Write an enzyme that holds these catalytic residues in place. Structure first.
Site, PDB file in Angstrom:
ATOM      1  N   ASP A  30     -11.608 -21.951 -85.317  1.00 41.76           N
ATOM      2  CA  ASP A  30     -11.332 -21.238 -84.451  1.00 41.76           C
ATOM      3  C   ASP A  30     -10.133 -20.336 -84.641  1.00 41.76           C
ATOM      4  OD1 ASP A  30     -10.961 -20.299 -82.053  1.00 41.76           O
ATOM      5  OD2 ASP A  30      -9.832 -21.830 -81.048  1.00 41.76           O
TER       6      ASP A  30
ATOM      7  N   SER B  52     -11.306  -1.520 -80.604  1.00 42.43           N
ATOM      8  CA  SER B  52     -12.370  -0.988 -80.692  1.00 42.43           C
ATOM      9  C   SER B  52     -12.512   0.461 -80.204  1.00 42.43           C
ATOM     10  CB  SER B  52     -13.568  -1.866 -80.119  1.00 42.43           C
ATOM     11  OG  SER B  52     -14.804  -1.278 -80.288  1.00 42.43           O
TER      12      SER B  52
HETATM   13  C1  3AI Z   1      -6.998 -18.908 -71.744  1.00 36.99           C
HETATM   14  C2  3AI Z   1      -5.435 -19.526 -71.420  1.00 36.99           C
HETATM   15  C3  3AI Z   1      -5.452 -20.809 -72.110  1.00 36.99           C
HETATM   16  C4  3AI Z   1      -4.559 -21.703 -71.244  1.00 36.99           C
HETATM   17  C5  3AI Z   1      -4.371 -20.307 -73.525  1.00 36.99           C
HETATM   18  N1  3AI Z   1      -4.984 -21.067 -74.805  1.00 36.99           N
HETATM   19  C6  3AI Z   1      -5.351 -20.421 -75.702  1.00 36.99           C
HETATM   20  O1  3AI Z   1      -5.163 -19.212 -75.607  1.00 36.99           O
HETATM   21  C7  3AI Z   1      -5.937 -21.028 -76.877  1.00 36.99           C
HETATM   22  C8  3AI Z   1      -4.810 -21.082 -78.116  1.00 36.99           C
HETATM   23  N2  3AI Z   1      -7.138 -20.442 -77.411  1.00 36.99           N
HETATM   24  C9  3AI Z   1      -8.151 -20.051 -76.787  1.00 36.99           C
HETATM   25  O2  3AI Z   1      -8.169 -20.520 -75.460  1.00 36.99           O
HETATM   26  C10 3AI Z   1      -9.379 -19.239 -77.283  1.00 36.99           C
HETATM   27  C11 3AI Z   1      -8.895 -17.686 -77.125  1.00 36.99           C
HETATM   28  C12 3AI Z   1      -9.706 -17.107 -76.176  1.00 36.99           C
HETATM   29  S1  3AI Z   1      -8.569 -16.453 -74.957  1.00 36.99           S
HETATM   30  C13 3AI Z   1      -6.770 -16.454 -75.407  1.00 36.99           C
HETATM   31  N3  3AI Z   1      -9.732 -19.701 -78.641  1.00 36.99           N
HETATM   32  C14 3AI Z   1     -11.032 -19.967 -78.749  1.00 36.99           C
HETATM   33  C15 3AI Z   1     -11.406 -21.389 -78.124  1.00 36.99           C
HETATM   34  N4  3AI Z   1     -12.564 -21.088 -77.070  1.00 36.99           N
HETATM   35  C16 3AI Z   1     -11.105 -22.699 -78.666  1.00 36.99           C
HETATM   36  C17 3AI Z   1     -12.453 -23.691 -78.133  1.00 36.99           C
HETATM   37  C18 3AI Z   1     -13.334 -24.080 -78.844  1.00 36.99           C
HETATM   38  C19 3AI Z   1     -14.370 -24.982 -78.600  1.00 36.99           C
HETATM   39  C20 3AI Z   1     -14.181 -25.455 -77.258  1.00 36.99           C
HETATM   40  C21 3AI Z   1     -13.470 -24.998 -76.414  1.00 36.99           C
HETATM   41  C22 3AI Z   1     -12.323 -24.031 -76.896  1.00 36.99           C
HETATM   42  C23 3AI Z   1      -2.951 -21.031 -73.389  1.00 36.99           C
HETATM   43  O3  3AI Z   1      -2.352 -21.759 -73.865  1.00 36.99           O
HETATM   44  O4  3AI Z   1      -2.204 -20.558 -72.314  1.00 36.99           O
END
Ligand code: 3AI
Length: 330
Positions: A35, A199
């Protein structure tokens, strides 16, 4: 030093990709989801609530001689998915495709959300974003890339995801055999701790290119491509029968329709995503309605260049003092 490991799709829809990782001594192999959108390295383990594990391969720290508990350290993570995980921390040896790192923080899961339990093919995650995002406390930990950087022939890693096929993750070098033409590099902002870039615009099908700045992040951990409402609307307007469903929670289209390609800009260069990559199959078994691979980011708060866009190019993550993102056609 270098490292290269094969990454494989978890299903016929390329919902996610798993890569074998060796942890401990002797080695315990677990299939992790790389990730670039997170910075935590967590895995299901012997500490995980027995009720929360369903078929996954767990890490047993007690069986590793290089494993050491990091006293008082705990972690807690939440994904844009609503997904969550938490537990304790250990330090151990971790190897990816031949590249070894000693003293790496391995976050052992004590509690896992339902979403994870449901996914039997994913044993844990390996975050590749910037270390400032690590959730370990009271002492924050560094990512695997950060720990290898020093020893790499080059502070870089490349992402070469395949469409309905295996791909590759390389560390420390650029396989000039994996892409065509030249690599176009673009500036990266670390302010929020993500591989954030801008982009230069887009095009729908054989349509005219629209020069507009789109700020988003390269996230291998996200399946789809999330763009602004205006852009998404322009794409779907080209698909007969396509429409936004509040019940399904996104754009859907008649399974018999032919999807047009989508072009995204990288500097003066252009990456084309074949329409085939945008088809996500029937919303439900037997349904004649299919789910689109391009959805709105209106509710997310940020644009996300997920697997759908990333898999259409050879991606270079340059972790130099001044990080940069490289894109190339393949
Ligand atoms: C979206 C808001 C959340 C709560 C936020 N968390 C994040 O940004 C974390 C680090 N990164 C993620 O949530 C994301 C980034 C996209 S939005 C920032 N990383 C990819 C992610 N889908 C990991 C995953 C893989 C497989 C199954 C489920 C999830 C936070 O800490 O506040």
């Amino acid at each position: 030093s270098t490292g290269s490991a094969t990454t494989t799709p978890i299903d016929s829809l390329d919902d996610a990709y798993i890569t074998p990782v060796q942890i401990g001594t002797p080695a315990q192999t677990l299939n992790l989801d790389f990730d670039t959108g997170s910075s935590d390295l967590w895995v299901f383990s012997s500490e995980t609530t027995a009720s929360e594990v369903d078929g996954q391969t767990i890490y047993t720290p007690s069986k590793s001689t290089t494993a050491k508990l990091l006293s008082g350290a705990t972690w807690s993570i939440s994904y844009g998915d609503g997904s969550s995980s938490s537990g304790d921390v250990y330090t151990d040896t971790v190897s990816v495709g031949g590249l070894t790192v000693t003293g790496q923080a391995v976050e052992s899961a004590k509690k896992v959300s339902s979403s994870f339990t449901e996914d039997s093919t994913i044993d844990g995650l390996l975050g590749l974003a910037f270390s400032t995002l690590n959730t370990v406390s009271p002492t924050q930990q560094k990512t695997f890339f950060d720990n290898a950087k020093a020893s790499l022939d080059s502070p870089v890693f490349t992402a070469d995801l395949g469409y309905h096929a295996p791909g590759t993750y390389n560390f420390g070098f650029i396989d000039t055999t994996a892409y065509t033409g030249s690599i176009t590099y673009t500036a990266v902002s670390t302010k929020q701790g993500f591989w954030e870039w801008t982009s230069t615009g887009y095009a729908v099908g054989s349509g005219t290119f629209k020069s507009t700045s789109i700020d988003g992040i390269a996230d291998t951990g996200t399946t789809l491509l999330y763009l602004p409402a205006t852009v998404v609307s322009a794409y779907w307007a080209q698909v007969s029968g396509a429409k936004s469903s509040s019940s399904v929670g996104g754009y859907v289209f008649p399974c018999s329709a032919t999807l047009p390609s989508f072009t995204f800009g990288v500097g003066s260069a252009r990456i084309v995503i074949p329409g085939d990559y945008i088809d996500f199959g029937p919303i439900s078994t037997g349904s004649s309605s299919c789910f689109g691979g391009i959805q709105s980011s209106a509710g997310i708060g940020i644009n996300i260049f997920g697997d759908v866009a990333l898999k259409a190019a050879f991606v270079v993550f340059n972790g130099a003092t001044t990080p940069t993102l490289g894109f190339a056609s393949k």
